[PDB]
Ligand binder design. Sequence first.
Ligand SMILES: *[C@H](C)[C@H]1/C(=C/c2[nH]c(/C=C3N=C(/C=C4\NC(=O)C(CC)=C4C)C(C)=C\3CCC(=O)O)c(CCC(=O)O)c2C)NC(=O)[C@@H]1C
Ligand SMILES: *[C@H](C)[C@H]1/C(=C/c2[nH]c(/C=C3N=C(/C=C4\NC(=O)C(CC)=C4C)C(C)=C\3CCC(=O)O)c(CCC(=O)O)c2C)NC(=O)[C@@H]1C
Ligand SMILES: *[C@H](C)[C@H]1/C(=C/c2[nH]c(/C=C3N=C(/C=C4\NC(=O)C(CC)=C4C)C(C)=C\3CCC(=O)O)c(CCC(=O)O)c2C)NC(=O)[C@@H]1C
Ligand SMILES: *[C@H](C)[C@H]1/C(=C/c2[nH]c(/C=C3N=C(/C=C4\NC(=O)C(CC)=C4C)C(C)=C\3CCC(=O)O)c(CCC(=O)O)c2C)NC(=O)[C@@H]1C
Ligand SMILES: *[C@H](C)[C@H]1/C(=C/c2[nH]c(/C=C3N=C(/C=C4\NC(=O)C(CC)=C4C)C(C)=C\3CCC(=O)O)c(CCC(=O)O)c2C)NC(=O)[C@@H]1C
Ligand SMILES: CCC1=C(C)/C(=C/C2=NC(=C\c3[nH]c(/C=C4\NC(=O)[C@H](C)[C@H]4CC)c(C)c3CCC(=O)O)/C(CCC(=O)O)=C2C)NC1=O
Lengths: 161, 161, 161, 162, 162, 162
Amino acid sequence: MQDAITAVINSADVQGKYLDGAAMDKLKSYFASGELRVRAASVISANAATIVKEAVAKSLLYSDVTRPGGNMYTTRRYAACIRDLDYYLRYATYAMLAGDASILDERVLNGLKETYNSLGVPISSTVQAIQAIKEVTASLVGADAGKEMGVYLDYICSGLS
Amino acid sequence: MQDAITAVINSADVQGKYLDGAAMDKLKSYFASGELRVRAASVISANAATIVKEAVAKSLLYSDVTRPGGNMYTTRRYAACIRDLDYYLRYATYAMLAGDASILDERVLNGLKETYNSLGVPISSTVQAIQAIKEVTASLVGADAGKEMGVYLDYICSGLS
Amino acid sequence: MQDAITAVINSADVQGKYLDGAAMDKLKSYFASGELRVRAASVISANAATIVKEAVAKSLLYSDVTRPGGNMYTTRRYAACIRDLDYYLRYATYAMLAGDASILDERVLNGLKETYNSLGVPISSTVQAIQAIKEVTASLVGADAGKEMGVYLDYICSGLS
Amino acid sequence: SVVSQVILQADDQLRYPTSGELKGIQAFLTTGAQRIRIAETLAENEKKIVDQAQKQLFKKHPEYRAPGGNAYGQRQYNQCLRDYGWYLRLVTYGVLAGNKEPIETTGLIGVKEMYNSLNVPVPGMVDAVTVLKDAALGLLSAEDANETAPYFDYIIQFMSHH
Amino acid sequence: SVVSQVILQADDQLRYPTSGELKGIQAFLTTGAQRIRIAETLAENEKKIVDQAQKQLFKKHPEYRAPGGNAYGQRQYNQCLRDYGWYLRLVTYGVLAGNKEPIETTGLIGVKEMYNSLNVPVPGMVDAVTVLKDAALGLLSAEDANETAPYFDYIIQFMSHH
Amino acid sequence: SVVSQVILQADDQLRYPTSGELKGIQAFLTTGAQRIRIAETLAENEKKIVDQAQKQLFKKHPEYRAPGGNAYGQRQYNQCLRDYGWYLRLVTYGVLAGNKEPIETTGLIGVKEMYNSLNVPVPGMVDAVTVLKDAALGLLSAEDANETAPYFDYIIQFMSHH
Ligand SMILES: *[C@H](C)[C@H]1/C(=C/c2[nH]c(/C=C3N=C(/C=C4\NC(=O)C(CC)=C4C)C(C)=C\3CCC(=O)O)c(CCC(=O)O)c2C)NC(=O)[C@@H]1C
Ligand SMILES: *[C@H](C)[C@H]1/C(=C/c2[nH]c(/C=C3N=C(/C=C4\NC(=O)C(CC)=C4C)C(C)=C\3CCC(=O)O)c(CCC(=O)O)c2C)NC(=O)[C@@H]1C
Ligand SMILES: *[C@H](C)[C@H]1/C(=C/c2[nH]c(/C=C3N=C(/C=C4\NC(=O)C(CC)=C4C)C(C)=C\3CCC(=O)O)c(CCC(=O)O)c2C)NC(=O)[C@@H]1C
Ligand SMILES: *[C@H](C)[C@H]1/C(=C/c2[nH]c(/C=C3N=C(/C=C4\NC(=O)C(CC)=C4C)C(C)=C\3CCC(=O)O)c(CCC(=O)O)c2C)NC(=O)[C@@H]1C
Ligand SMILES: *[C@H](C)[C@H]1/C(=C/c2[nH]c(/C=C3N=C(/C=C4\NC(=O)C(CC)=C4C)C(C)=C\3CCC(=O)O)c(CCC(=O)O)c2C)NC(=O)[C@@H]1C
Ligand SMILES: CCC1=C(C)/C(=C/C2=NC(=C\c3[nH]c(/C=C4\NC(=O)[C@H](C)[C@H]4CC)c(C)c3CCC(=O)O)/C(CCC(=O)O)=C2C)NC1=O
């Protein structure tokens, strides 16, 4: 994985260059965004279980997905689904903190689509729940932090589709 | 794996239904077949080595398969082949006892065809030997148990082809 | 793996035959080549680091490969490349000693091309370095041993292409 | 069922089932008619059983249907009754299989994680299945009640422990 | 052969062969002419060797060719003689390789499982190879018989154990 | 950087970053302006810094530019100056990242294997970076020199210890 600083450093290193003005401007942007990112990470950590249960209530409960024939039927599958959502929120928070999506490619999305397809986990419904996580999260961390989290939750969704 | 009872239960569960009359009739048939299945399993267990050596004598011995260039040539390959036949008989007996072929899909056939084709193990000759196992088994457990064992030995053969 | 003797034995065994005159002639050739092979193995072992160092200097140093954007840039990749060359020399020496390339198929080339293409390791430059290893080795072990080593170093190159 | 369990043990040990294991299977399979009678009696009486059970449950726990309670309001209360019918159905599966496996795989593994996420009190579920057991066993003969009680008990113990 | 054995040990230890291992290879490769002479002598005399051996074998074990015996009847007896020629052939491979490997991989791993499945007595095979050894070594010089005896002994010992 | 370090530890423990870890990230990110000033000062003065450094290096080690020395001749000497500029650049990366990671992954893992293969003395590299440190820190304020010294020291210690 890389965070936003290592990403800019790597782009320079592979050219054998010191960081130029444009590169330093990218670092300045990330350094200045520190308070935003750290506060949002603290809020999400403190509210992680609530965010997931509210997202599930909005997007999945009382639907076909939780009835026999649906992929959340059986307590075992219900719990597995919740666990997935716990994962997506935690890893999106990592990526938001890092200002970089690489940890998502390396540790979330790698072979995930094939795993779901083999098991019959519905992509459409999963993406709907992640989108619900995005909106619940935004209601708590505010508009500006909500946008950053939205980038990385959207990233996971795009990677599944 | 499932046995015949769990298979009927699962068909009901995925619909969120109690077992109806047709489902209960399937269970009744399986419960009534208990004596047949248990007796056959005891006979096969007691005679497992004899069944395999007699099948081999009928289908593979004195043929091209056991001469140089054939896949049973060398004591190492001869013994490996016997071991496969021991497997097929034991797992077919499990499936017969369970009244369900799922254990064959999960624990015998999974990746087996690919394994044989990579090693050069002849499918045709393997199927001939399993068919010989079916007929020797039938001679010992009788006509009726012989039919049940035949279903599951045939299942393995179809899975290889 | 097989050495030259086991290869000839296997060719006879799969036919169920004693070794005929032509087969014995192959064995005689290998037995007679013993002094050549053992001396070369001793020389290469004693000079393995020098051979690789000199090959790299001839084929890779001061080129695009060792500058940013090239696959040997960074001390980590530089050292990994050297380690590969150490491998190729050692396994070619095994194969030369055995008078048989099977150890190369089994322990060097197996999945190697795919590994390199996944990592972005350049095949062209690797093959150039191995060819340089061939010429440095030939300068030390002489013309006759050089030819034998050349067979197995060329074998590795063909396997990468 | 009982049969699968024996087979999994045998396969683990690379062996045929033992004479003892086969005798156990034989004994299980001769008890089929009783198990089917129990399953059909519970199925036929589901509405009556669930009604008796929910009446006792909410007499003990009226707070569940008061404001702020998890079963407050008709849609939520009706979903509780739905769950009740589902656990009764799982008990019939257990009785037919002769073991807890179909109950565990469908209704117990992850059950605490699920109901916690739903804000349904797990001790409430323990109390619910306890009076479900009372209602169901009351419709069976003494012999059949004894056969059936451990399947309810398994659910109750599972929801109580760890 | 001796060469591949050294190479496998070296590879296991991520190293070149040692000076000692190389000296051992050198010594093995200069003994090639002797090994080839032994191999050709046994090949040339196969029919005579197997005939002497089978005569002694069935003088000791006439029950093998009596009714109910594994070698009863011409087809079965001839298959024993076939096997005899195969083990003689494997011994020549062992002598050429300078180790037991070609004998073991073709004729010893799984040999007891095979002959048990065929109802051929493994102690009969031990006795068979013992008198095969006698017949074969009798046609070699003292020096060559000493070189060759360990390959027969390896077969005999393998079939006696486990 | 410091941020990814925290994230990797948290992920290893299947948890969110702790309040303590987040405080540490906050403190790091407010020190960005200083790190950028240091990086730009070293970049701007690269030629001057490398010149002072190489002058001191080859005063101590004239044998490196004598016949048989690794830096004998203009092409080789110029490649040394090239390497010098590269390590100065890696130090600026370390300062910006707040840890040694960008230095280690690009210029230290395998560094001894590389320079040994090039016949460049590793103790010469230790001496080279020592006087590079001297030259670079001399162009910074006292505060910034203290901030920057540990990144040079890490290189020096790495190249000293096996
Ligand atoms: C919930 C929104 C939906 C749902 C999900 C569901 N997922 C699984 C099983 C798996 N999910 C994962 C996912 C991950 N594992 C990881 O390590 C990571 C990464 C950080 C992820 C994203 C995996 C690997 C599995 C399979 C292995 C396992 O179960 O641990 C299931 C269970 C499928 C089954 O029957 O076994 C389900 C039900 N299903 C839905 O319907 C939802 C919309
Ligand atoms: C005998 C009828 C024929 C024959 C068979 C033969 N098989 C192999 C090798 C393998 N067979 C298996 C099969 C299984 N392994 C399992 O765990 C199971 C399932 C429960 C099965 C069915 C496998 C995995 C192998 C490869 C690994 C191993 O050997 O254990 C061989 C040996 C091939 C070789 O040269 O290594 C042979 C000879 N060959 C015949 O000619 C027969 C018709
Ligand atoms: C009734 C005795 C108790 C009660 C229950 C109650 N449950 C819900 C909501 C849900 N229940 C389930 C249950 C299951 N899903 C399964 O796969 C299985 C296994 C067979 C079960 C048992 C689910 C998924 C829901 C969520 C909605 C949906 O069906 O999608 C409620 C609704 C309110 C809430 O969620 O809090 C209630 C009230 N409440 C009680 O007080 C009783 C002790
Ligand atoms: C003769 C000294 C003894 C003897 C032997 C005997 N063998 C058989 C039958 C078979 N022998 C083999 C042998 C091999 N297959 C191999 O791959 C190898 C390794 C090189 C060997 C040695 C086989 C496969 C057979 C089966 C038939 C076939 O060839 O397909 C018999 C036939 C009767 C029987 O099977 O019982 C006999 C009689 N019997 C003796 O008494 C001797 C001690
Ligand atoms: C100068 C302070 C010292 C010195 C150095 C010197 N280096 C070389 C040649 C090479 N240096 C490198 C260096 C790197 N490759 C990398 O990926 C990295 C990491 C960022 C480094 C630092 C390489 C690859 C070379 C080889 C040539 C090439 O660029 O392809 C020389 C050349 C002579 C030689 O190889 O021996 C020298 C002289 N010599 C000193 O005395 C100093 C202590
Ligand atoms: C005995 C068999 C065997 C081989 C052959 C082998 C090769 C080998 N080379 C690798 C990497 C590598 N190989 C090189 C090689 C080079 N890059 C260049 O530009 C050069 C032209 C070249 C040197 C000649 C590089 C740079 C890597 C590292 C790639 C990376 O991780 O970025 C890797 C990936 C895993 C690792 O780094 O250890 C393997 C497996 N490993 C083995 O076990």
